[PDB]
Paper text:
The substrate-binding protein YfeA (also known as YPO2439 or y1897) is a polyspecific metal-binding protein that is crucial for nutrient acquisition and virulence in Yersinia pestis, the causative microbe of plague. Yfe is an ATP-binding cassette transporter made up of the substrate-binding protein (SBP) YfeA, the ATP-binding protein YfeB and the membrane components YfeCDE. SBPs are classified into clusters according to their three-dimensional structures and the clusters correlate with the substrate specificity. YfeA is a cluster A-I SBP that binds metal atoms such that site 1 binds Zn, Fe and Mn atoms and a secondary substrate-binding site located on the surface (site 2) binds Zn and Mn atoms.
Here, structures in which metals are inter-coordinated by multiple YfeA molecules are reported at 1.85, 2.05 and 2.25 Å resolution. The crystal structures show how a metal can bounce around site 2 and trigger distinct assemblies of protein–protein interactions. The metal recruits site 2 residues, other surface residues and His10 tag residues from multiple protomers to collaborate in metal coordination and form crystal contacts in the lattice. Three histidine residues of the His10 tag are resolved in one protomer and no histidine residues are resolved in the other protomer in the asymmetric unit. The arrangement of ligands results in square bipyramidal coordination geometry, where the His314 ligand is at the apex of the pyramid and the other four ligands form the square base. Square pyramidal coordination geometry is commonly observed in protein–manganese and protein–zinc complexes. Varied configurations of YfeA crystallographic packing show how multiple polypeptide chains can collaborate with site 2 to coordinate the metal. These configurations include a non-site-2 residue from the surrounding negative electrostatic region (YfeA site 2 inter-coordinated structure 1) or multiple site 2 motifs (structures 2 and 3).
Author numbering: 40 to 311
The structure:
């Protein structure tokens, strides 16, 4: 039976599986579409994690459930995959000053995710070290090749008009890399107050700058974004993918597809 890796959520599953190739099985705890910040694990998840040889998670306070869940797991090592990530801080709300956990939305950060996951796989399954090393380098080259198409895809939005209005403030790392000012209805997924007041502050920012499009994301409700759309007259741009891939048969089966689809959907929103 092959070396088994279990990850907290789907983005890490797909990156690790590319590095693992056919010498290791990598599975996600959270299923596609499920909210990952305050996920409530199930009996299935304990059995799945307990059957793994290694458990990977994001850290940076992403999985608020993980440490309690990991208590119920005996004699399975865990490894965070975000060593060396430079955090962007959350700037408003009850989590101000905590790291924004969504670092994988920058493809240059994905190279660090790859290196950290390569290091963990090699450390815990050294028999397959050269497969992990070969796959990690090959996959890293795939990530590097995205920068040119992605920039070209957004090249038609003039710099002054690059406002990214979303529901969760989950795109800070992507926005910083591609010169977007970010606007959001809540800084991070959580049980929290202040969203109704922030909804009106976003409406003011949209009206002030005549921002033409707003978005929601695949693991949360589209209702706040559509309410903002109706009240401002801005177009509802659809669903961006940050916290989860789709199923393998859906439109966003891989991490590369997530970056491309999100950037494409954004550019579509500004299309004239
Ligand atoms: Fe999130």
């Amino acid at each position: 039976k092959k070396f088994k890796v279990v990850t907290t959520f789907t983005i890490i599953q797909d990156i690790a599986q590319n590095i693992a190739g056919d010498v290791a099985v990598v599975e996600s705890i959270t299923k596609p579409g499920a909210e990952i910040h305050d996920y409530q694990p199930t009996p299935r998840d304990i059995v799945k994690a307990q059957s793994a040889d290694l458990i990977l998670w994001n850290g940076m306070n992403l999985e608020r459930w993980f440490e309690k869940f990991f208590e119920s797991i005996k004699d399975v090592p865990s490894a965070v995959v975000t060593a060396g990530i430079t955090p962007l801080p959350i700037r408003e709300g009850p989590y101000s000053g905590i790291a924004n956990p969504h670092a994988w939305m920058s493809p240059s950060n994905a190279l660090i995710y790859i290196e950290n996951i390569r290091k963990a796989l090699v450390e815990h399954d050294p028999a397959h070290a050269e497969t992990y090393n070969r796959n990690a380098q090959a996959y890293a080259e795939k990530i590097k090749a995205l920068d040119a198409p992605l920039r070209e895809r957004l090249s038609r939005i003039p710099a002054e008009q690059r406002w990214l209005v979303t529901s969760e403030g989950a795109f800070s790392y992507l926005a910083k890399d591609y010169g977007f000012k970010e606007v959001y209805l809540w800084p991070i997924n959580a049980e929290q107050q202040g969203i109704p007041q922030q909804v009106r502050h976003v409406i003011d920012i949209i009206r002030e700058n005549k921002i033409p499009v707003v978005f929601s994301e695949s693991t949360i409700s589209d209702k706040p974004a559509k309410q903002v759309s109706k009240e401002t007259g801005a177009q509802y741009g659809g669903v961006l993918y940050v916290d989860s891939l789709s199923g393998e048969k859906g439109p966003v089966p891989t991490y590369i597809s997530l970056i491309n689809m999100t950037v494409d959907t954004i550019a579509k929103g500004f299309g004239q």
